[PDB]
């Protein structure tokens, strides 16, 4: 409804906005399509411009900044003067800037604070993930390093954390959204899919590092059969770490719902805890599309499958 840019208000030009995020996505993504007459052409929107989308929030019905990022790419058509943007929050910067860091044994929160301090990234008070990580040397992107240590934190019994940018970097635990919205009331169509596609019933740990930690921790072998994996990570250097990694991998296969909603719940985001029918599910992916009729589509799943796949 309001698109601030730097100074102007280009909400008087946009054909539609689509706010999309994935649980493992690089960044909260806003793809706003505009018509580009002389008026919009004058201001000369370039890549790197700062877009802030403001719309009436679902919670309190007050205008709140639902998106605050930067224009990552502009594509302009000439025959039809339709300028199209693809906005990203500043976690896209972290996913592109490579750097090598050597880390001793420590927790994920300390590592994230170290990254932010090194690269001068503003950040709120980061939640203590608690889990203690093994010494590693990293080379991938900063977001890649953060995701790697968060995955290793999900292993060893730690809670599932996800990093979202907003104005200043936030360490967002998955099941900690304020409002557990119920989608059954506006359920245009749902697609309950169940499978054994990524089911894990057994896991045979073969430790590449010593405390000779080896074991098997089959959990539902009698019911679904011995759907076995082999976890052979150097980071597992402990018997309890092996047991917790095994326990953080068992699941009954893929179990998700491809939900389609006729009303756009504005504040939904990846990782949020949302209800369909009596059950509760975590948002694997959300794709708003703020056309003339607000609309939302969701892909949600159980905790076990999400932990198995994305962690």
């Amino acid at each position: 409804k309001i698109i601030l840019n730097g100074k102007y208000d280009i909400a008087n030009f946009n054909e539609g906005i689509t706010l999309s995020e994935a649980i493992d996505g690089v960044a909260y993504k806003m793809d706003v399509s505009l018509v580009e007459p002389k008026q919009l052409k004058d201001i000369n929107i370039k890549k790197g411009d700062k877009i802030i989308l403001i719309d009436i929030a679902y919670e309190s019905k007050k205008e709140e900044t639902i998106f605050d990022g930067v224009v990552w790419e502009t594509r302009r058509s000439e025959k039809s003067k339709k300028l199209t943007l693809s906005c990203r929050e500043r976690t896209v910067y972290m996913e592109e800037s490579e750097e090598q860091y050597q880390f001793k044994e420590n927790t994920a929160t300390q590592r994230i604070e170290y990254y932010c301090k090194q690269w001068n990234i503003p950040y709120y008070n980061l939640a203590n993930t608690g889990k203690k990580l093994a010494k590693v040397i990293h080379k991938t992107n900063i977001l890649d390093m953060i995701k790697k240590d968060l995955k290793e934190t999900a292993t060893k019994g730690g809670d599932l954390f996800r990093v979202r940018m907003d104005n200043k970097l936030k360490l967002f635990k998955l099941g900690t959204n304020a409002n557990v919205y119920k989608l059954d009331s506006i359920l245009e169509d749902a697609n309950f899919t169940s499978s054994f596609n990524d089911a894990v019933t057994s896991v045979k740990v073969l430790g590449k590092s010593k405390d000779p930690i080896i074991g098997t921790y089959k959990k539902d072998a009698d019911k679904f059969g011995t759907l076995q994996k082999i976890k052979q990570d150097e980071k597992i250097k402990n018997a309890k770490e092996a047991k917790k990694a095994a326990e953080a991998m068992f699941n009954s296969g893929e179990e998700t719902i491809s939900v389609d909603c006729a009303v756009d719940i504005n504040r939904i985001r990846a990782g949020d805890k949302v209800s369909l029918k009596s059950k509760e599910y975590y948002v694997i992916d959300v794709t708003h599309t703020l056309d003339s009729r607000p609309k939302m589509k969701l892909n949600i799943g159980s905790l076990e499958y999400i932990r198995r796949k994305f962690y």
């Binding site: 994935a22 493992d24 996505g25 690089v26 993504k29």
Partner: peptide
Amino acid sequence: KEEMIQELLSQVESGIREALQDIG
């Protein structure tokens, strides 16, 4: 009658490229 092919090939290319860039 024929522009549907161009339109939806563009949509397929954009969607798959977009997903690969996001997840990758």
